[PDB]
Amino acid sequence: KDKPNQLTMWVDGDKQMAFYKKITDQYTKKTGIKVKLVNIGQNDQLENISLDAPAGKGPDIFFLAHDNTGSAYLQGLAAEIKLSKDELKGFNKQALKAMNYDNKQLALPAIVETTALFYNKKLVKNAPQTLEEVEANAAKLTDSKKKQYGMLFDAKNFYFNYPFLFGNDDYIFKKNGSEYDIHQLGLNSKHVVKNAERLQKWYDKGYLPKAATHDVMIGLFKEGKVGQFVTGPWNINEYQETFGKDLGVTTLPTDGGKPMKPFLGVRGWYLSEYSKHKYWAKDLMLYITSKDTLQKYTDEMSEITGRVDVKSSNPNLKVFEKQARHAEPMPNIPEMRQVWEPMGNASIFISNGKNPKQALDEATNDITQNIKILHP
Amino acid sequence: KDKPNQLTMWVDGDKQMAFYKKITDQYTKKTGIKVKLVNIGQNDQLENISLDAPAGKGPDIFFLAHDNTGSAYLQGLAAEIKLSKDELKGFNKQALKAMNYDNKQLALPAIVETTALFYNKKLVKNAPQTLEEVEANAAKLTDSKKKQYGMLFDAKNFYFNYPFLFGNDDYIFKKNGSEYDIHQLGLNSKHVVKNAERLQKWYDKGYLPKAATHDVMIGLFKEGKVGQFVTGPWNINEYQETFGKDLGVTTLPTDGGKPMKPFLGVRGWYLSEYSKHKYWAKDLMLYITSKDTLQKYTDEMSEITGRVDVKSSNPNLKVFEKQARHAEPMPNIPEMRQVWEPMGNASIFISNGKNPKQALDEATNDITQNIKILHP
Numbered sequence: 067k068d069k070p071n072q073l074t075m076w077v078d079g080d081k082q083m084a085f086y087k088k089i090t091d092q093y094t095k096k097t098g099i100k101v102k103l104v105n106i107g108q109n110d111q112l113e114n115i116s117l118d119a120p121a122g123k124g125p126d127i128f129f130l131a132h133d134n135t136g137s138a139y140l141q142g143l144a145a146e147i148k149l150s151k152d153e154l155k156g157f158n159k160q161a162l163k164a165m166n167y168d169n170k171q172l173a174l175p176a177i178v179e180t181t182a183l184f185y186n187k188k189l190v191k192n193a194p195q196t197l198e199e200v201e202a203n204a205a206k207l208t209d210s211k212k213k214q215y216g217m218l219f220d221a222k223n224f225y226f227n228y229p230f231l232f233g234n235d236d237y238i239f240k241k242n243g244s245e246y247d248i249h250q251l252g253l254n255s256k257h258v259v260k261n262a263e264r265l266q267k268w269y270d271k272g273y274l275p276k277a278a279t280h281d282v283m284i285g286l287f288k289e290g291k292v293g294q295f296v297t298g299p300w301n302i303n304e305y306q307e308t309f310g311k312d313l314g315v316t317t318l319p320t321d322g323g324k325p326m327k328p329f330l331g332v333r334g335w336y337l338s339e340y341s342k343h344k345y346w347a348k349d350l351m352l353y354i355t356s357k358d359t360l361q362k363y364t365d366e367m368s369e370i371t372g373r374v375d376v377k378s379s380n381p382n383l384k385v386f387e388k389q390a391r392h393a394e395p396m397p398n399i400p401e402m403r404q405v406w407e408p409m410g411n412a413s414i415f416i417s418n419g420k421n422p423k424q425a426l427d428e429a430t431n432d433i434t435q436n437i438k439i440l441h442p
Numbered sequence: 443k444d445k446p447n448q449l450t451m452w453v454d455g456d457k458q459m460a461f462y463k464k465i466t467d468q469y470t471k472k473t474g475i476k477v478k479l480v481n482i483g484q485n486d487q488l489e490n491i492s493l494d495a496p497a498g499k500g501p502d503i504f505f506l507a508h509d510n511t512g513s514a515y516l517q518g519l520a521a522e523i524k525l526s527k528d529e530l531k532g533f534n535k536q537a538l539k540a541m542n543y544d545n546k547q548l549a550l551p552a553i554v555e556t557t558a559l560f561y562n563k564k565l566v567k568n569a570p571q572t573l574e575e576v577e578a579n580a581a582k583l584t585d586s587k588k589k590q591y592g593m594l595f596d597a598k599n600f601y602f603n604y605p606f607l608f609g610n611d612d613y614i615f616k617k618n619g620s621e622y623d624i625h626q627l628g629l630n631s632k633h634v635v636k637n638a639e640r641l642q643k644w645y646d647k648g649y650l651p652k653a654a655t656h657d658v659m660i661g662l663f664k665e666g667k668v669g670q671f672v673t674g675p676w677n678i679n680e681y682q683e684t685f686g687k688d689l690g691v692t693t694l695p696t697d698g699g700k701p702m703k704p705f706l707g708v709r710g711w712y713l714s715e716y717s718k719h720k721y722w723a724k725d726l727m728l729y730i731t732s733k734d735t736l737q738k739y740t741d742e743m744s745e746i747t748g749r750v751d752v753k754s755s756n757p758n759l760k761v762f763e764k765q766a767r768h769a770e771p772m773p774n775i776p777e778m779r780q781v782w783e784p785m786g787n788a789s790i791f792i793s794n795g796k797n798p799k800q801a802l803d804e805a806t807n808d809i810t811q812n813i814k815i816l817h818p
């Protein structure tokens with residue numbers, strides 16, 4: 067079980083590749099094992115590996131968005147990684163779960179992302195602690211013609227409205243332990259339906275504009291016409307550039323005392339079943355996911371990582387670090403793919419005045435029949 | 443006209459880069475000019491070039507989807523390319539137009555794509571020539587709960603329903619010659635409303651299922667439950683493997699005696715304004731888009747190219763070659779980004795029974811509104 071001469075890794079982008087080269091160069095000085103890096107987009111790595119791995123041209127470790135976890139495993143491409151408690155130490159717990167399928171840890175998280183609550187201090191001086199407070203700010207600051215809104219988020223997209231519709235006891239697929247049951251949908255629960263009725267109420271009160279897309283909301287927020295905006299960290303720098311000290315960022319507030327959890331997206335390192343040096347591949351994977359490495363990663367890339375012990379020096383990103391510890395993984399199973407469009411359609415219908423129970427009942431029916439078609 | 447030591451090109455993906463190293467290895471033997479290839483995905487190239495070009499570290503030529511032509515030019519990143527009549531010979535005419543902005547040719551088309559009409563010969567023996575017989579096939583082969591449909595396409599998505607809604611004299615943005623006028627929209631013209639009513643009638647007659655997504659439609663077609671399916675060429679191998687000689691492929695039919703024209707998508711090579719060797723970059727661009735190079739390309743990649751003198755050996759792809767010469771470029775201006783979601787929403791509403799004139803009137807007003815906010 068001694069060292070091989072080389073280990074290959076599939077990195078997502080030229081930017082990350084340049085960063086992991088530096089890191090792996092140090093790995094080579096420490097261990098003597100050379101590391102070959104290949105730039106393959108994460109969106110193309112799963113298809114590519116299914117072809118290259120069986121022919122001996124695949125990598126020892128590769129990189130994917132966590133929602134591909136079940137599919138990667140089911141195809142016999144992603145191998146189980148057995149880890150020590152000491153090796154798991156410092157990793158975001160829900161991030162690990164996001165990369166766990168059939169009760170097996172299939173990857174280590176490198177990058178995590180969620181939404182958070184941005185606010186314009188010139189319009190909202192204090193960080194909203196409750197949803198009732200966010201609503202109160204919506205009521206005060208929303209002006210009809212002036213394009214001024216107290217509260218915005220892309221409520222027609224399930225990704226964004228998720229935390230406003232699903233509480234801790236609600237679910238998409240029922241979890242009978244770690245196993246999502248694909249035949250038990252919670253999309254049309256009494257509680258989700260009530261939250262969806264509230265969402266429609268926000269549309270009825272004029273708090274959420276029907277015509278605006280997520281990109282319009284971004285523009286409006288930058289223009290200084292929006293008090294509160296729930297979105298991802300993608301435009302942090304330009305929001306900081308535009309607002310300076312007036313840019314506020316906070317975690318999602320509590321909803322009736324229970325804290326809101328946005329979707330958690332995770333991207334990270336998988337072990338190839340076709341790797342012939344699984345011990346050392348794992349060793350390299352741990353080295354590139356160490357506190358040291360991922361701290362340098364957050365410093366140099368301004369992204370939140372899968373390590374809770376990594377600390378950005380940007381207080382705005384510190385908020386997303388916290389939010390990442392209080393979030394819910396997008397189900398990592400293939401059937402989750404069937405959920406997005408019907409819930410998106412339901413959300414569009416809700417915004418247009420459709421009875422929310424009917425909208426969600428129809429989405430649930432549609433998801434059920436689509437899963438059967440694509441996954442007998 | 444005196445050669446540089448090296449030329450740099452940004453390629454979209456590892457697979458394409460492997461193909462262009464071989465071509466450029468030959469280029470270097472002919473000219474003596476070294477070529478450096480870097481793998482940067484086309485969705486990341488504008489942003490990357492925006493930052494690297496000014497620092498003297500950008501490429502000589504880069505690769506984008508034609509939809510970014512206007513933006514690339516407005517930011518002073520893409521340079522005009524002066525071309526001979528003989529240098530233009532063999533290029534798909536609409537593909538060139540897709541890459542032409544402010545009356546300037548800004549790129550040469552490498553890859554093109556449109557939808558076409560697939561049909562299962564066990565259900566539909568002959569290639570349908572007219573929309574009227576597409577419908578007749580729909581009336582005859584659509585059966586309630588056997589999940590059998592004579593006709594399918596993702597009518598909720600504007601990219602797919604476009605040819606069914608817009609005829610030759612209809613338009614998104616009015617073309618005052620070659621340049622689009624962002625303030626004159628045609629999305630709600632009488633003729634388009636009329637086609638939208640026809641589309642609603644296909645939902646009312648049960649020809650198009652409301653619950654199905656594109657991915658479901660793909661599944662149903664592969665199960666042998668669908669007579670006719672309008673979609674792109676992306677799964678052509680899977681369909682061939684499944685049906686063999688029973689896979690029919692034809693161009694979109696005539697509608698009222700006129701050719702239905704789907705959207706044309708083009709991807710290709712732009713010339714960086716920051717290149718210090720524009721003459722020779724142009725030379726390299728012409729070499730990598732020659733009949734010889736693109737013929738080799740279609741052979742190894744199974745993609746349709748921007749050259750009409752390139753012929754695939756696959757008869758199913760020959761159909762796509764022809765379709766690409768009878769298509770309409772997606773408007774290549776930034777304002778087109780505001781069009782997609784509102785038209786998608788209107789299509790969804792139409793599928794749900796909303797009055798099509800209202801649906802399209804609201805989309806039009808929303809687009810007008812969103813364009814003003816994002817481009818003031």
Ligand SMILES: OC[C@H]1O[C@H](O[C@H]2[C@H](O)[C@@H](O)[C@@H](O)O[C@@H]2CO)[C@H](O)[C@@H](O)[C@@H]1O
Nearest residue numbers: 133179223225226298331396406407410
């Ligand atoms: O349309 C459904 C779509 O939603 C999610 O995509 C997110 C993405 O994760 C974020 O990075 C950001 O761009 O917002 C997107 C909104 O769609 C799912 O992750 C994706 O799988 C799904 O198709």
Ligand SMILES: OC[C@H]1O[C@H](O[C@H]2[C@H](O)[C@@H](O)[C@@H](O)O[C@@H]2CO)[C@H](O)[C@@H](O)[C@@H]1O
Nearest residue numbers: 507509555599600601674707772782783
């Ligand atoms: O958001 C809509 C989207 O429409 C077009 O995208 C097409 C794409 O060109 C095809 O390759 C295929 O995958 O269908 C896509 C839509 O489902 C536009 O190209 C794109 O700009 C636009 O965002």
Ligand SMILES: [Cl-]
Nearest residue numbers: 196197198322
């Ligand atoms: Cl509350």
Ligand SMILES: [Cl-]
Nearest residue numbers: 525526527528
């Ligand atoms: Cl000439």
Ligand SMILES: [Cl-]
Nearest residue numbers: 572573574698
């Ligand atoms: Cl006809």
Ligand SMILES: [K+]
Nearest residue numbers: 297298300301
């Ligand atoms: K944003």
Ligand SMILES: [K+]
Nearest residue numbers: 403404655657
């Ligand atoms: K689906």
Ligand SMILES: [K+]
Nearest residue numbers: 660673674677
């Ligand atoms: K397809």
Ligand SMILES: [K+]
Nearest residue numbers: 279281779780
């Ligand atoms: K938009």
